[PDB]
């Protein structure tokens, strides 16, 4: 199933601290954000995605079409410009964010009814798991 539509509530968050530190998020912001539980609202229509991640402190939005490279300004996080491209590797949705940081991107997939989001930057990998609400 390649269907990420819906509202998703975080159940687990592994190594979010490492990912944020790899992005150079300022200490105070990072210390608060590592504590947070996130909710995702995903609108998926063909290749068109509108994504909205929310918490009490850090909110992140991205819109894209699969297979269409786009400029992303990561102003809610590290405030960098990346050239982002989201494509399918099987049923895994894969984003590569080309720019200053090496190995920067994310992957997302459904397994056992749960949504998995893997965030990478540098040598850090963060794994988040969400249940469908
Ligand atoms: C799956 C597509 C939409 C979607 C992509 C997405 C990408 C990244 C992201 N984060 C890292 C900057 C915050 C946890 C959250 C996201 O949330 C989404 O809903």
From Swiss-Prot:
CDD domains: CRBP2. It comes from Homo sapiens (Human). Intracellular transport of retinol. It holds the Pfam family Lipocalin. GO terms for molecular function: fatty acid binding; molecular carrier activity; retinal binding; retinoid binding; retinol binding. Keywords: Cytoplasm, Retinol-binding, Transport, Vitamin A. InterPro entries: Calycin, Fatty_acid-bd, ILBP, Lipocln_cytosolic_FA-bd_dom. Higher expression in adult small intestine and to a much lesser extent in fetal kidney. PANTHER family: FATTY ACID BINDING PROTEIN (PTHR11955). One of its GO terms (cellular component) is cytosol. This is Retinol-binding protein 2. PROSITE patterns: FABP. Forms a beta-barrel structure that accommodates hydrophobic ligands in its interior. Its main location: cytoplasm. Belongs to the calycin superfamily. Fatty-acid binding protein (FABP) family. One of its GO terms (biological process) is fatty acid transport. It comes from the Eukaryota. All-trans-retinol binds at residues 40, 108. It is found in: Cytoplasm.
């Amino acid at each position: 199933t390649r269907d990420f539509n819906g509202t998703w509530e975080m159940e687990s968050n592994e190594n979010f601290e490492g990912y944020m530190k790899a992005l150079d998020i300022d200490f105070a912001t990072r210390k608060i954000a590592v504590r947070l539980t996130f909710t995702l609202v995903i609108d998926q229509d063909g290749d068109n995605f509108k994504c909205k991640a929310t918490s009490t402190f850090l909110n992140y939005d991205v819109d894209f079409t699969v297979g269409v490279e786009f400029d992303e300004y990561t102003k809610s996080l590290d405030n960098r410009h990346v050239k982002a491209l989201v494509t399918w590797e099987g049923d895994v949705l894969v984003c590569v964010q080309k720019g200053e940081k090496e190995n920067r991107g994310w992957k997302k997939w459904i397994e056992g009814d749960k949504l998995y989001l893997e965030l990478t930057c540098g040598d850090q990998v963060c794994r988040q798991v969400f249940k469908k609400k």
